Amino acid sequence: GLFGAIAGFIEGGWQGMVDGWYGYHHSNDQGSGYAADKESTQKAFDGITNKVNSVIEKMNTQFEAVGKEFSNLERRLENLNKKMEDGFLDVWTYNAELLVLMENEHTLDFHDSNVKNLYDKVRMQLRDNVKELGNGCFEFYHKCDDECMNSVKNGTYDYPKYEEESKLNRNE
């Protein structure tokens, strides 16, 4: 994928994450579990919804075939009519089939970007308070309880709060 996250450095998807497209699996003393990222899933949902309305609405004034008849002395006109209606049919077939191929490519890359962006958001917040394992996971240099995990997930992780504790653990 263009952004290198899906089927990339994050090797596989999570069957156990049922309530969204992107999210978290945490692991600490209290236990473990999956949780969807609400903000990024909804933003992706709004975009994709808009895309599927936009593709649909652009082909609302497509060419429509009208049934006409022609006599045996009107073969050139009949052929002209046939060429014209078939001509537009091929134009709109091409249009519909290409828009879909192109938008499918972009949709898959959009999702890939959203995962990568979510990873970078979490990474740029944790800094050197964690180890980056390279598989989409971060290992904490300080104990991160359930309320600490939720600050990571909702984007309010307090780096200065854990700086000194992490620094000590990482050094010794």
Binding site: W14, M17, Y22, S27, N28, H111, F140, Y141
Partner: peptide, 13 residues
């Protein structure tokens, strides 16, 4: 080995 958070994505059947 310490506590972990992982970023991932949906898979289904």
């Amino acid at each position: 080995p310490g506590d972990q958070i992982c970023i991932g994505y949906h898979a289904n059947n």
